[PDB]
Amino acid sequence: ASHSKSLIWEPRVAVSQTFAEIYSQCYEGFKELCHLDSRFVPFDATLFSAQSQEVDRTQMTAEENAALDKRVDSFLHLVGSRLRLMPAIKAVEWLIRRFRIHEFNTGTLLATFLPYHTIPAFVTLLSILPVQRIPIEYRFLDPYIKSLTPPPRAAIVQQATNRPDLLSAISRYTLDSCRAKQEYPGLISFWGGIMAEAVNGMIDKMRLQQIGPVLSEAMVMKDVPGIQIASYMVVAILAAKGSLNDNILTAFMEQLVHGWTVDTLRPGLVCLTMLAQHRSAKQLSGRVAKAVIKVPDLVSSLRDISKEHQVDKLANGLVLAFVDRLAKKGDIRTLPVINSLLLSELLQEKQAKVAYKALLLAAHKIDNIRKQVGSALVRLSQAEGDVGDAIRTAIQEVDFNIEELELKLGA
Amino acid sequence: HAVVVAPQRLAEIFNAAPAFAMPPIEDVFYQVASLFSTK
């Protein structure tokens, strides 16, 4: 009947098997999974217990089925990292034969197998799914179900590009895994590549508030750095292709720094350089500035990043953000930051010059503190190289005299 | 202002291996961010 559908035994063998036969063979695969990862052991009392061989799903109430559904979905997230191993296939086999999870859980089953869509096991799964239960967002798989061949990766990409419900479905599954700490590298890479190619597609063709909340939740999964970094890819591509306005570019930066950790710090930094590079506004927000100067030796870090990307607008936005903070609260603590940033040679001439002019008026704007800002103004006007040239030309153009300050600071 | 990139070039990065045998996501990030650079 439906008893012949199996991942492991061919229909002529599978139709005759008793549940005891299936159980004792699949149970061995599950206990081998337990030896590898203790998180499987809880299920030894539920999905894989001795009682389970006799459990008939159709005699359960609507809650009891829904609780069974949750245990199965949980197990599927856990076993997903090992579907290349035969004991994992054996454990899934048990759920298919005994609880018919290819009928009652076919969306979770499919998403679990999807990162493995190039291995023979995936075609074998396709060959036993009851088509009537395959969710709408996976019916692009129909030609591979009839031909029993692996779907190329560009079929998945192209369907996710063109039909957001697959994309939304891959993302939801990936994030439920992360939240449950059942993620694994292949899942993070797979969701990352699908999301990158798709979003690159979605915009390429149209020359996006559905995936916003996904990127934002990923950017703050501190316990899952791979998901954070992979979301840095997508957020990179988005901004690098004119696709966002200044206020939403800022909120991505704000969310990035709000969730980044030491393990994600460098890729997060190059992502910040790209975000700001495509802002039309110049002055970065306070929240990003305060967080970006906590990088140990920020200047040398942006100089390293500058051998592949452009760093000048991140640098510029920082200085103005700190100049602005001094103009508005007279905080001398900003002067080491401004000074090391101005002299860094990461700004360009006119950036430096409006930076310096703005610094002058920031000094003017507050009514000791005049001692150190003045001294900082003067030290900068004497700087040895290009930045000093710009600072001096900028002092000529503003009709400001350093000298009376140079002398009044002396006295 | 924006970057012109060929979809084939972003597609080479995620076709070098199946998901399970890819370089660390950190290395893939750098590849992708380098391909979409402003210089």
Author numbering:
A (entry chain A): 27 to 233, 248 to 407, 415 to 458
B (entry chain B): 917 to 955
Paper passage:
The 5' region of pre-rRNA that consists of the 5' external transcribed spacer (5' ETS), 18S rRNA and the internal transcribed spacer 1 (ITS1) is co-transcriptionally packed into a terminal ball of ~40 nm in size. These particles represent the earliest assembly intermediates of 40S and are known as the 90S pre-ribosome or the SSU processome. Within 90S, the pre-rRNA is cleaved at sites A0 and A1 in the 5' ETS and site A2 in the ITS1, yielding a 20S pre-rRNA intermediate. The fully assembled 90S contains an unprocessed pre-18S rRNA, U3 snoRNA, approximately 51 assembly factors and 18 r-proteins with a molecular mass of 5.0 megadaltons.
The EM densities were docked with the available crystal structures of yeast 40S ribosome and AFs or homology models of AFs. Utp10 is a large protein (1769 residues) with mostly α-helices by prediction. The N domain of Utp10 contacts with the WD domain of Utp4. In addition, the WD domain of Utp4 and the N domain of Utp10, in an L-shape, wedge between the U3 snoRNP and UTPB complex and organize their positions in the back. The WD domains of Utp18, Utp21 and Utp1 interact in order with the WD domain of Utp4, the N domain of Utp10 and the WD domain of Utp7, respectively. The U3-5' ETS helix Ha interacts with the WD domain of Utp21 and the N domain of Utp10. The box C'/D side of U3 snoRNP (Nop1, Snu13 and the NTD of Nop58) fits into a U-shaped trench formed by Utp4 and Utp10.
